[PDB]
Design a binder for this molecule. Structure first.
Ligand code: NI
Ligand code: NI
Ligand code: NI
Ligand code: NI
Ligand SMILES: [Zn+2]
Ligand SMILES: [Zn+2]
Ligand SMILES: [Zn+2]
Ligand SMILES: [Zn+2]
Lengths: 211, 211, 211, 211
């Protein structure tokens, strides 16, 4: 009666699901959100194949650290293990958003990383890497994403989309938004000429300012 | 009094017509939707040259399998035969949407097919072909589209737009949305570099996962 | 008390002004609309430098065929003569919209015409020409636009925007929308490869079908 | 009780903050607005790291000409000195908007200036320069922006965004909007071919017409 993920967290997943569509970051398809409660060691995650605008609190799936479902009758997001393995391996990430955005996914389909052509990428790191390709919803994708997000708060998923993580959903959402913006700026700059990339020293400074 | 297409289906055509404009997939011009009732062998289709936001149930045109109008005083969509020939030749398609979208139409005007640069194209097939050009509203266009959509759930219409089909309008709409997204990703990737295309084996796997 | 432009026409100018912003064709700046009453030989036109969402019926300016203001205390659109000279020289145009759209203006800034890469351009003609450059609001621009719109229902204004005309504002608006769409398709196709342009014979056929 | 910045000015900052998001010029992050009262010699500026839709009048920070905070408990925008140095060095600017827009920022990340491919750039000058890069929120950025905006009403901030100034917030907002539009037209034209740039003499004429 207090042992499971709170109503607050479930409602918040729904809120940010909607925000992703409202701001036109994604239509929702193949996208998913989760939060991890560190005290309880439970992940709450969006369900598979339900439109973001139709998700109810009862559709949220709650899982333990080994992926055993403890609340919810819906099937969890097909990407549940991609989220869970992050929480298993990183203490600095308590909320994750996966989305099929526009320019971030362009870069992912080129299998091209995103460098510091705009300073705001420092919300994720000096750059955003591209994970090795693996089929959606597989262990291979989960592992590939974990590895390529090491030392970063976002990662591109080859031929697929983006994954971002932060301390909470507001910050995770901000990272998705900012990485998508940076991806867009970078791609558009590439059309015109050679984007100027800020040096690592400047990005190291940026990281410290952003704290 | 039960022999014709239901009110439910007519209202649904109107709903999805509106959804196409609301989500900015199209302005509506030259676009059309239909459903086929297999038990009754009747097609219900949107009328010609009426703004999607002004279509009433009484403007929906109902036709038999040979194109004889049995309900409605409005002229049917100029593309009625492009829809009807699909229903005549395919048992797996009960709803069709034709739209003049953005990047899908870019590809159509280049007469360039859409490959699997993004895995989500599997909602339509391993790729989306481009039909041979023919004048809008003609038998030639209908036949060209039927042939080039064989084995797929979407097809590009040269210098024109897109046609998609599925089991119902919700799924047909999802295909239009997803194919337009994939077209956009592919085009934008082409601007930057060489889009990475997933191999046929992976797409065959994708088809099976999507079932 | 019946000798001037009707309330109906004034309200309609306001309506379509708003529609241009609502549909994101333009923000309104430098844009203008007019209608010509053939029986009365009066042009009603939007005023200069008033936000489309702030235009009242009393701000509409009514002019005779020689540009003498007969109703309204506001200064007419700076482009009033670009509209008026069309009505003076063409009997087939009773409403005109000028807008600074996106891709149509891209083409205008390249001083590149728009060909029939998409069949829908037939709402304006087989192609849309680019007028010789002249300073906004000048007689030279008015004359350049008249000449380059001959035989067409739209024209690009070099380094400036688009002008379209039709029998009424609904149709003029549709032309702006469709020409902007075609411009966009053409530009985007050019990024990928060589847009396929429909031959003049097919466009001649298109003109006859569109009647 | 009359010695500080008025309620009117504070509310107006909030209004234009919102307008920047409503019109999709920016999401708000890293963006800021200010006004300078010349009689009082006070700058009112938006606060740091508060969503534009959550800013209250009490969050507005008021500063004297040397940057001493005289009203507000919130930390001022990190860019407060970039705004303040403009007011210190220019008598023709009483309101400033900084934004991370799209195509203007593309140009900034290329470190490419914006020329007169569209005549509307005359709201800012014959062209818009790019300032030397410096870290956000620093004196160096403030000085670089002051220098590169000399003789202009807008400037691009390398790898960052845009700064614009005018007599009031309505006009400053219009400059941001118009410069972003011009940047977009220029970038898109560059994709197709060589944008035609209006000569300085024509732009000198444009400046005089715009007065
Ligand atoms: Ni409990
Ligand atoms: Ni019946
Ligand atoms: Ni009268
Ligand atoms: Ni006081
Ligand atoms: Zn996904
Ligand atoms: Zn069509
Ligand atoms: Zn204009
Ligand atoms: Zn900034």
């Amino acid at each position: 009666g207090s042992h499971m993920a709170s109503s607050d967290v479930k409602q918040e997943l729904i809120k940010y699901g909607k925000k992703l569509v409202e701001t036109d970051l994604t239509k929702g398809t193949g996208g998913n959100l989760s939060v991890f409660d560190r005290e309880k060691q439970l992940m709450a995650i969006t369900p598979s194949g339900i439109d973001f605008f139709e998700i109810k609190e009862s559709d949220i799936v709650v899982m333990d650290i080994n992926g055993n479902v403890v609340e919810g009758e819906r099937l969890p997001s097909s990407e549940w293990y991609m989220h869970l393995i992050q929480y298993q391996t990183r203490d600095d990430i308590d909320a994750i958003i996966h989305a099929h955005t526009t320019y971030a996914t362009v870069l992912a389909c080129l299998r091209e990383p995103l460098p510091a052509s705009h300073y705001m990428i420092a919300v994720a790191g000096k750059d955003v890497r591209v994970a090795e390709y693996a089929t959606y919803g597989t262990k291979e994708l989960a592992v590939n994403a974990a590895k390529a997000m090491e030392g970063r708060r976002a990662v591109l998923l080859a031929n697929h989309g983006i994954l971002a993580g932060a301390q909470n959903l507001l910050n995770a959402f901000n990272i998705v938004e900012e990485v998508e913006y940076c991806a867009k700026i970078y791609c558009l700059a590439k059309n015109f000429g050679e984007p100027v990339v800020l040096p690592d020293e400047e990005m190291e400074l940026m990281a410290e300012k952003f704290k």
